Structures are given as C-alpha cells and as structure tokens.
Amino acid sequence: FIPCPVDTSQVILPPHLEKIRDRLAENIHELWGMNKIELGWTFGKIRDDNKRQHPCLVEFSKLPETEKNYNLQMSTETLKTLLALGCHIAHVNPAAEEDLKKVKLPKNYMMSNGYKPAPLDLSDVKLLPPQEILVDKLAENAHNVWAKDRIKQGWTYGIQQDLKNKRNPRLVPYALLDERTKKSNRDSLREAVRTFVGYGYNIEPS
Numbered sequence: 001f002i003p004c005p006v007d008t009s010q011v012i013l014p015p016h017l018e019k020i021r022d023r024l025a026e027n028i029h030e031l032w033g034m035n036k037i038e039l040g041w042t043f044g045k046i047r048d049d050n051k052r053q054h055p056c057l058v059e060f061s062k063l064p065e066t067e068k069n070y071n072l073q074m075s076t077e078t079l080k081t082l083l084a085l086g087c088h089i090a091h092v093n094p095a096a097e098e099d100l101k102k103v104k105l106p107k108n109y110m111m112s113n114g115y116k117p118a119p120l121d122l123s124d125v126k127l128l129p130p131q132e133i134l135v136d137k138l139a140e141n142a143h144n145v146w147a148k149d150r151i152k153q154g155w156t157y158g159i160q161q162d163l164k165n166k167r168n169p170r171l172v173p174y175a176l177l178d179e180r181t182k183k184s185n186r187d188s189l190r191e192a193v194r195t196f197v198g199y200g201y202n203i204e205p206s
C-alpha cells in the first residue's frame with residue numbers, strides 16, 4: 001500500500017490566503033470537537049483512552065503547539081492541493097464574513113475547560129455539482145496526505161489501534177476503507193469548501 005497524493009511541493013501559498021488558512025483550521029477543529037462529544041468523549045488533562053477524556057477538546061487558541069501545527073499544516077496542504085489541481089481561491093463577496101453566524105449547541109456540550117464547540121452555521125450554503133466532485137476528490141487525497149506522514153513515522157496496519165506503537169486499522173487504501181470513514185472525509189472537506197464560501201471565496205479552475 002502506497003499513499004501518494006497530489007504533489008504539493010511545486011506550490012506556494014500566497015500571504016493573502018493565510019487568513020482563511022487560520023480560520024479554516026479553527027472551523028475544522030470546531031467540527032471535530034463537536035463530533036467527539038457526540039460520541040462519548042469529555043475534557044481531560046491526562047489522556048486515558050478508556051475514560052473518554054481528551055486534552056485536545058479545547059478552543060483553538062489553547063491547543064498545544066505539537067497538535068496545533070498539524071492542524072495548520074493540513075489546512076495549508078488542503079489549500080495548496082486546490083492550487084495544484086488548477087483551481088483558484090478568490091474573495092468576491094465582502095460581506096459574507098459578517099453574515100457568517102456560528103452554531104450554538106445544547107447546554108450539555110460545555111465541558112470542564114470553558115470550551116463548547118461552536119462551528120460556523122454553514123447549513124444554508126449550497127454547492128454546485130462541480131464542487132461536489134472536488135470535495136469527493138479532495139477527500140481521497142486527505143486520506144493519502146494523512147497516510148504518508150504516518151507511514152514515515154512507522155505507522156502500518158494493525159487490527160487494534162494503539163497510542164504507543166505505529167498501529168492503526170485505517171492505514172489502508174481508500175477502496176478498502178469503511179464507507180463511514182470515507183463519508184467522514186467527504187463531510188469534513190464539504191464544510192472546508194463551505195468554509196471558503198462562507199468567508200466570500202469563489203473556487204474556480206483556471
């Protein structure tokens with residue numbers, strides 16, 4: 001198994017896109033924090049996988065640096081991937097960031113750190129068919145960018161996951177991957193494109 005994604009080396013990120021790169025990472029983390037509470041997890045300072053405690057379920061500004069850069073790099077690689085495919089990212093609607101409210105969840109979503117997930121309310125954002133094929137294609141690539149970095153840290157396949165060896169049952173080709181995870185990647189990058197549009201960006205191939 002060889003996870004080779006679209007080559008992101010012959011690509012640079014213009015400084016005017018660094019703004020979305022920062023906000024895109026925030027929203028992607030907000031969506032993660034919500035889904036994690038939605039499935040048995042809570043806040044903690046000493047991670048114990050059996051107790052469902054997590055230190056990363058905090059606001060984007062309070063994250064540790066090791067996990068933080070990974071969220072900014074993956075966000076930067078996502079933008080660069082669109083550029084490597086021949087698509088452009090450009091601001092057109094200047095009032096969209098002001099007309100971008102955030103989702104507010106029930107009271108039970110607040111934990112012992114003062115953090116309560118508040119992703120952007122992007123439910124009223126519609127995508128054209130061409131942008132759907134992009135999100136589906138971007139999703140398969142996000143699996144490869146994740147799998148390549150893990151592989152060089154020694155991560156291979158293993159029936160049981162493990163935070164102390166390089167084992168993970170999802171280190172497999174996108175075809176041999178459970179459709180739940182495949183759909184999860186598509187949903188994540190569907191909001192990624194909606195995050196751009198929510199800030200006033202038009203995605204358009206050259």
Ligand SMILES: Nc1ncnc2c1ncn2[C@@H]1O[C@H](COP(=O)(O)OP(=O)(O)CP(=O)(O)O)[C@@H](O)[C@H]1O
Nearest residue numbers: 028029030032033054056057063067070071184188
């Ligand atoms: N599938 C995904 N899509 C977008 N961001 C993800 C992600 N998985 C993890 N992240 C980001 O990674 C950061 C936390 O890193 P961590 O190592 O704790 O992942 P994790 O605990 O979710 C492993 P798993 O999801 O398999 O149980 C989180 O703040 C989150 O934003």
Ligand SMILES: O=C1CN(/N=C/c2ccc(-c3ccc([N+](=O)[O-])cc3)o2)C(=O)N1
Nearest residue numbers: 024025028071074075078142143146170
């Ligand atoms: O088990 C798994 C896990 N995984 N992806 C995990 C990685 C970890 C960090 C992120 C990440 C993605 C996108 C952005 N972004 O664009 O901002 C920011 C961070 O995904 C996968 O494919 N199968």
